[PDB]
Ligand binder design. Structure first.
Ligand SMILES: [Mg+2]
Ligand SMILES: [Mg+2]
Ligand SMILES: [Mg+2]
Ligand SMILES: [Mg+2]
Lengths: 23, 132, 195, 150, 304, 129
RNA sequence: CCCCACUAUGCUUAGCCCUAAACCUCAACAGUUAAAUCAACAAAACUGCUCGCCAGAACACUACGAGCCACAGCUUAAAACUCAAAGGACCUGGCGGUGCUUCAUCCCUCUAGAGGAGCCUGUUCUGUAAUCGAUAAACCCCGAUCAACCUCACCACCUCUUGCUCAGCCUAUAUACCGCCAUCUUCAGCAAACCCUGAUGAAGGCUACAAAGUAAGCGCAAGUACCCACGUAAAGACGUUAGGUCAAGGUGUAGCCCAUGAGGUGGCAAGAAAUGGGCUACAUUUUCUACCCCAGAAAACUACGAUAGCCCUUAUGAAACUUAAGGGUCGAAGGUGGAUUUAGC
C-alpha cells in the first residue's frame, strides 16, 4: 500500500518539532 | 489509401453488385469494360467524341429511367449502330417501359444520327454479389 | 533476384567433373546425385573454364571498373600485366647470371605476391582481427586508391599500377607503408581491446 | 524462463560434479577445470582460463566432450551437446595480442551554434535595413430521450 | 441443398444437349473439353483470370464439394467423425494411423508434397498450418517406414510432380549437324553445330574474331567447347540479333551449348548443365517505377 | 491418445460417433454457429476418459451439462464425478479396462439397435394385419 | 554522498526515560471443515464466548486539562473554521534515469552521390501596382504531363448590367463534405455475430503429444499483369495525423448582386541574398578526330572546364534582347569539396 497517511503524519510531526524548536 | 471506385466495407450488410464489388485494378482481370468501341484501339480516331457520347448516354439513361436501372449500362457499337444494354428492375408497368424504350431510341437516334437500339433485361431485384 | 532460391550457383571446374568415380567418397557421390536434381544458375559472363582465368585478377578488374566500363578496366589490367612483364624482362636482361635466378618474370605471380604483401593482418575504435575476404578486399582497395591518387600527374593507370605492384612485390611502396601504419595504430590502441 | 534457469543451474552442477570426480577421467581430474557459466539454448559452457596450459586444457576438454555427454546421458538424460568456451577474459584481447606478436610492422564549447544564430541575426538586420474540460462521466446522453419520444 | 444439386445436374444435362445442338455435334459424345471450347467460342472473354471467364461445367465442379448438410432428414450425421468439425482431415489421419499399425503388424526425385491449399481443396475443409505439418510428418513417417504398394499409392495421392527442366539433322550434303536456339536479355541467337569440323565459327556470316572485337565475348564463345574439351573439333554457323555485344555473346553461348549437347555424352550433358551452360539466364532489365530515379533507386530524400 | 484409434474404430463400427481430438472451444455450446442452426446435438455422451491431458476435467463434461446432454462416464480415483450424469467408477488407464468398456458399450449399442429393428419390423408386420 | 582523525554514544555498575513498521500489520479461549468457500488482496472459510477499540476526511502522534524522576518529553486527547469527498483492494492504459530475451538496415562494413564551384529549377526573403495552394518526415522540377499574349485566378486603367446559363462569384469555411490521395504500410491485423471463463465486478479467452475459443466478412495471403514457380508491379483492411485539396469538379453553411460578377488594353517575372533538388564539371579509366573498342594527336596559361554572358542567325508565333535551336565570341569559377547526409542487395 501507499504511505500517504504515514507521510502526512511525518510532515505534521516535522512541522510540530520545528514549531517547538522555534518557540 | 486508395479510394478510386472502391466500396469500403462498413458493417458487412451493404449489398453491392459484381461491378461495384471489384476495384479498378480488376478491370480486364475480373470485369470487362462497360463500353465497347473501336475508339481506343491503335491508330483509330474519334476517341474523345465516343467518350463524350458514352457519358451523355449514361447520364440520359439514368435520368430517363428513374430508379429503374439495376446496374450500369453496356454501350456496344457495331459500325454506326449503338446498342444500349441495360438491366432494369421490375417496378414500372411494362407500358411505361415500352414507352420509355421507344422514346429513348427515337430521341437518341435523332440526336446522334445513328440507329440506336435499347435492349432491356429485367430482374426482380438488384443482384447482390456480396455484402459489405 | 530473378533466380528462385531453389537455384544453385554453378561450379565451373573441369577437374571436378573429370574426377574418377572411384575417388569420390560416399558423401561426394550423394552430393553429385543431389546436384543431378538441382536447378543451376546460368554461368555469369565473367568467369569461364579458361586455364588462364584468374579470379583474383577478375575481382581486381571489377573493382577497377568505373561505370560498368568492363572493357576499359580489362584493358587497363592487361596493360598493367604487360608493363610489369616488360619491366621485369628489362631487369632480367640487364642483370648478371646470378641475379637472373632471383628475378621473377611471371606477372601473375608478381601480382599475387604483391597483393599478399599488401594484405593487413590486423584492423580497426578497437583493433580487431580481419577475416580473409576483408584482408583481400582491403589490399585491392588500397592498391587501387593509391594508384588513383592525384599525386601522380599525367601518368597513365597501367604505368602507375605496374610501379606500385613492383614496389609491393619488394615489400616497399606507399601501400605497404599504409599497411604498416594500420598495424602501428592497432598496436597503439591495443590497450582498448577490452572493449 | 525460470524453468530454463533451473535447468541451467542443474547442468552447471552436473558438469561441476563430473569435473570434480576422478572416475570420469584421470586427465580431466588432474586438470581441475572450473566452470564460470553454463547456459542452455545446445549447451554453452564457459570455464575460467589460467597459454600452453590453457591450450592443453582446451584440447583435453574437446577430446573428452563426447565422453562427458555420454556420462551426462546416464543421469537429464536428454542432454544437448555441450560447447566449451574458453574465457580468456576478453578473448578478443588475447587473439589480438597473438596476431600483433605474429604481425609485421616493417622498419621502425558554449553548447550552441552561435555562428548560425549570428547569421540569422544578420539576416534579420538586413531584412529590416486554460479552459474548462468537462468530466467524461458527466456528459449527457439523449438516446433515452429519443427512445421515450418514439 | 441436395435437391438443388439434382436440379442443377438436370439443367446441366439439358444445356449440354442444347450446346451440342448449337455446335452441330453428337450430344452423346460431347465431352467436357468440347463444352469448354464451345463456351469459349460463343462467349469470348479476354479477362486474365481464368476463373472469371464464362463456365458451364458439371455441377459437381461448379458447386463447392462441401456439399449440403452432412445429415439426413433424421438429423443423424453421415460421418462418424462429424463432431470433430474436421471429419475429412481426421478420417484421413485415422486411416493413415491404421496403415502405420498394419505396417507394424507385418514387420523424393520427381514428386513433392502438395501445399496446404491443395490439401484443403482435396478435403474441402479448412486446415491450420500446424495441422498440415502434423499430416506431412505422418505421411513422411509412413514413407520412411517400409511402405508397401498400397501405402505408395496412398502417398502418391499427395505426391506432386516436381517441375524439373536432342535432335540431329543432316544437310543437303550429308553433314550431320544439330540446330538450337538461345536467348539472353533481348538478344536472340540460333546456332548450328556440325558433328565434324575444325573449329570455325561464323557469326552472321562473319568470323567471330572480326565480329566480337572484345576478348570477353570470344571467351564466352570459347566456354562451352572448352568445357567439353572439343575446341577446334566442331564447326559453328550462328546468327544473333538484338541487344548489345555481351547479350549477343551470351545468347550465342547458350545456343551453342544447347546444340553441342546433341553430340557430347549424356554425362557430359549433365556436366554442362551443372556448369550453367544450358540454363537460360532470366536476368533481364527491370522496369523503372514511377516516382523513382530508376528500377530501384529512389529520388533523393530532400534535406531536412 | 493411447486409445484414440480404438475408440474411433469402435464408434464407427457401432454406428455412433467419436471425438478423440482436441475439443475445440464451443463444439457444443456454439454448435449452431459451427455447424449451422439445423445441427442435431448428441443425445448422449460417453466419456471413456473424463480428464484432459493436463489432468483437468474435460471441458466437454461442463459443456454437456450446459446443453443438458446426459453423460455416461468412466471416472477414475482422480476424476471429478460431480456433473457426470451416470458415473462408472473404474480404471481408465489399463488397456484391458478400456477394451472392456469399449466392448461393453459397443455390445449394448448394437443389441439396442438390433432390438429396435426387430420391434419395428414386428410392429409394422402386425399392424398391417 | 567519499577519505582521515576524533567525541557523545554502542560496553559495565546504579538509577531514569517508557518509544517503534513494538508487525505473524492475524486480540484471548473453545470448536468446526459441513454449508454459501469467498467483495478484492493478504493469510482457506467460519461459529461460540469475553475484553479492548472504531463511527467521514482534515484540523490532530495537536490545543487545553490531568498524570509522570519525564522540562524541546511521554500517556490520555478535543473543538472551531473548512471540504464532498477522504480512503481500501483491483482492472486497463500511459510511463519507468525498468529487468531480461531477440531483432532492424539503428551502427560499422560496400558502391556512387549531396554538403565546395558554375548553371537549370523550386522555395524563402526583399522589391514591385501585382495571384493562390503545398510548405517535419508525408513542401521545396509540388498542383504544372509545364506561364511571352492566351493560360490567369494577380495589378492598373477603361467598359457592361437579366449578363453564354431559368444568371453569376477562383468570395469565407478542407475545422461541414463528396470526389482523389499522402503517412505508418518496407504493416497483419481489423470489425461485426456468437461461445466460454472470472460466483455473471472492471475485465479475460494461449499451449499442436494443444488446456475455449469460433463458423463467416475485410486485409495480408491466393489469383492475375510483365519473361517462370522468382522478381517487379499491382494490391495493401481498420485505424493514426480535424494530413492535402472549397483553385479539378460537385456541394452544406455564410457572404457579393451598378459587383467579391462579366469584358477589353497594358503590366510584373528584379537580386543585396539564403536554401532545396538537378545538370555540367574539376580530367589521364581524361580531351579531340576516326571508329563503334588493336588508331593518331592533346595533356596546365593557347590544358581540362559554361547548357553562363555578349553578338548574329534560324524555328514557332500576329507579337521573341523574352522561348528553343545553331553559329560566332568569351575560356570564367573550379582543382574531388567539414560536420553531416541520400540511394542501393
Ligand atoms: Mg499538516
Ligand atoms: Mg486414470
Ligand atoms: Mg520486533
Ligand atoms: Mg486480551
Amino acid at each position: 500500500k501507499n504511505v500517504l497517511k504515514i507521510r502526512r503524519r511525518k510532515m505534521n510531526h516535522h512541522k510540530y518539532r520545528k514549531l517547538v524548536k522555534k518557540t | 489509401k486508395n479510394r478510386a471506385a472502391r466500396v469500403r466495407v462498413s458493417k458487412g450488410d451493404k449489398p453491392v453488385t459484381y461491378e461495384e464489388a471489384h476495384a479498378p485494378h480488376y478491370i480486364a482481370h475480373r470485369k470487362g469494360w462497360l463500353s465497347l468501341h473501336t475508339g481506343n484501339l491503335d491508330g483509330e480516331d474519334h476517341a474523345a467524341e465516343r467518350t463524350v457520347e458514352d457519358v451523355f448516354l449514361r447520364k440520359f439513361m439514368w435520368g430517363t429511367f428513374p430508379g429503374c436501372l439495376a446496374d450500369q449500362l453496356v454501350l456496344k457499337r457495331r459500325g454506326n449502330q449503338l446498342e444500349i444494354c441495360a438491366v432494369v428492375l421490375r417496378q414500372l408497368s411494362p407500358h411505361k417501359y415500352y414507352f420509355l424504350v421507344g422514346y429513348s431510341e427515337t430521341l437518341l437516334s435523332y440526336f446522334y444520327k445513328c440507329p440506336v437500339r435499347l435492349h432491356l433485361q429485367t430482374v426482380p431485384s438488384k443482384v447482390v454479389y456480396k455484402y459489405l | 533476384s530473378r533466380y528462385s532460391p531453389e537455384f544453385k550457383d554453378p561450379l565451373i571446374d573441369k577437374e571436378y567433373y573429370r574426377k574418377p568415380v572411384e575417388e569420390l567418397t560416399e558423401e561426394e557421390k550423394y552430393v553429385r546425385e543431389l546436384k543431378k536434381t538441382q536447378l543451376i544458375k546460368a554461368a555469369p559472363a565473367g568467369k569461364t573454364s579458361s586455364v588462364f582465368e584468374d579470379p583474383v585478377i577478375s575481382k581486381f578488374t571489377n573493382m577497377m571498373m568505373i561505370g560498368g566500363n568492363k572493357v576499359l578496366a580489362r584493358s587497363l589490367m592487361i596493360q598493367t600485366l604487360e608493363a610489369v612483364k616488360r619491366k621485369q624482362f628489362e631487369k632480367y636482361h640487364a642483370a648478371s647470371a646470378e641475379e637472373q635466378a632471383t628475378i621473377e618474370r611471371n606477372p601473375y605471380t608478381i601480382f599475387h605476391q604483391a597483393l599478399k604483401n599488401c594484405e593487413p593482418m590486423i584492423g580497426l575504435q578497437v583493433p580487431v582481427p580481419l577475416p580473409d575476404r576483408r584482408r583481400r578486399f582491403l589490399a585491392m582497395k588500397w592498391m587501387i586508391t593509391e594508384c588513383r591518387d592525384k599525386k601522380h600527374q599525367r601518368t597513365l593507370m597501367p604505368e602507375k599500377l605496374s610501379h606500385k605492384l613492383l614496389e609491393a612485390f619488394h615489400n616497399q611502396g606507399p601501400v605497404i607503408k599504409r599497411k604498416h601504419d594500420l598495424h602501428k595504430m592497432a598496436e597503439a590502441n591495443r590497450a582498448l581491446a577490452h572493449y | 524462463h525460470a524453468r530454463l534457469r533451473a535447468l541451467n543451474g542443474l547442468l552447471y552442477k552436473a558438469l561441476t560434479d563430473l569435473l570434480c570426480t576422478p572416475e570420469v577421467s584421470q586427465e580431466l581430474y588432474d586438470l581441475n577445470v572450473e566452470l564460470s557459466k553454463v547456459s542452455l539454448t545446445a549447451c554453452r559452457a564457459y570455464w575460467k582460463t589460467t597459454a600452453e596450459q590453457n591450450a592443453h586444457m582446451e584440447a583435453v576438454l574437446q577430446r573428452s566432450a563426447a565422453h562427458m555427454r555420454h556420462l551426462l546421458m546416464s543421469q537429464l538424460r536428454n542432454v544437448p551437446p555441450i560447447v566449451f568456451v574458453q574465457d580468456k577474459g576478453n578473448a578478443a584481447l588475447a587473439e589480438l595480442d597473438q596476431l600483433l606478436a605474429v604481425a609485421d610492422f616493417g622498419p621502425r564549447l558554449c553548447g550552441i551554434d552561435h555562428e548560425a544564430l549570428n547569421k540569422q541575426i544578420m539576416e534579420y538586420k538586413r531584412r529590416k535595413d486554460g479552459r474548462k474540460r468537462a468530466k467524461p462521466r458527466l456528459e449527457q446522453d439523449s438516446s433515452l430521450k429519443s427512445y421515450l419520444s418514439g | 441443398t441436395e435437391d438443388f444439386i439434382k436440379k442443377q445436374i438436370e439443367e446441366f444435362n439439358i444445356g449440354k444437349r442444347h450446346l451440342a445442338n448449337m455446335m452441330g455435334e453428337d450430344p452423346e459424345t460431347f465431352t467436357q473439353e468440347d463444352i469448354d471450347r464451345a463456351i469459349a467460342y460463343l462467349f469470348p472473354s479476354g479477362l486474365f483470370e481464368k476463373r472469371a471467364r464464362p463456365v458451364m461445367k458439371h455441377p459437381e465442379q461448379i458447386f463447392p464439394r462441401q456439399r449440403a448438410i452432412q445429415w439426413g432428414e433424421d438429423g443423424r450425421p453421415f460421418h462418424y467423425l462429424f463432431y470433430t468439425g474436421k471429419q475429412s482431415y481426421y478420417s484421413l489421419m485415422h486411416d493413415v494411423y491404421g496403415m502405420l499399425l498394419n505396417l507394424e503388424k507385418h514387420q523424393v526425385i520427381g514428386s513433392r508434397w502438395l501445399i496446404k491449399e491443395e490439401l484443403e481443396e482435396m478435403l474441402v475443409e479448412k486446415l491450420s498450418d500446424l495441422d498440415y505439418m502434423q499430416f506431412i510428418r505422418l505421411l513422411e513417417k509412413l514413407l520412411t517406414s517400409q511402405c508397401g504398394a498400397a501405402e505408395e499409392e496412398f502417398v502418391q495421392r499427395f505426391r506432386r510432380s516436381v517441375t524439373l527442366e536432342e535432335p540431329v539433322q543432316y544437310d543437303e550434303q550429308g553433314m550431320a549437324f544439330s540446330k538450337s536456339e538461345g536467348k539472353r536479355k533481348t538478344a536472340k541467337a540460333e546456332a548450328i553445330v556440325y558433328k565434324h569440323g575444325s573449329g570455325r565459327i561464323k557469326v552472321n556470316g562473319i568470323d567471330y574474331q572480326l565480329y566480337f572485337p572484345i576478348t570477353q565475348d570470344r571467351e564466352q564463345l570459347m566456354f562451352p567447347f572448352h568445357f567439353v574439351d572439343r575446341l577446334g573439333k566442331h564447326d559453328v554457323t550462328c546468327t544473333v540479333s538484338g541487344g548489345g555485344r555481351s547479350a549477343q555473346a551470351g545468347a550465342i553461348r547458350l545456343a551453342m551449348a544447347k546444340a553441342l549437347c546433341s553430340f557430347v555424352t549424356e554425362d557430359e550433358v549433365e556436366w554442362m548443365r551443372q556448369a550453367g551452360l544450358l540454363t537460360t539466364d532470366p536476368r533481364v532489365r527491370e522496369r523503372k517505377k514511377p516516382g523513382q530515379e530508376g528500377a530501384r533507386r529512389k529520388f533523393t530524400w530532400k534535406k531536412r | 491418445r493411447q486409445f484414440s484409434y480404438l475408440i474411433e474404430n469402435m464408434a464407427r463400427d457401432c454406428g455412433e460417433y467419436a471425438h478423440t481430438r482436441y475439443f475445440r472451444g464451443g463444439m457444443l455450446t456454439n454448435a449452431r454457429l459451427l455447424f449451422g442452426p439445423t445441427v442435431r446435438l448428441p443425445d448422449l455422451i460417453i466419456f471413456l476418459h473424463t480428464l484432459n491431458n493436463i489432468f483437468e476435467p474435460h471441458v466437454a463434461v461442463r459443456d454437456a451439462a450446459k446443453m443438458n446432454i446426459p453423460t455416461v462416464g468412466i471416472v477414475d480415483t482422480n476424476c471429478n464425478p460431480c456433473l457426470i450424469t451416470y458415473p462408472v467408477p473404474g480404471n481408465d488407464d489399463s488397456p484391458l479396462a478400456v477394451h472392456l468398456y469399449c466392448r461393453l458399450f459397443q455390445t449394448a449399442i448394437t443389441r439396442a439397435k438390433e432390438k429396435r429393428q426387430q420391434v419395428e419390423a414386428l410392429y409394422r408386420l402386425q399392424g398391417q394385419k
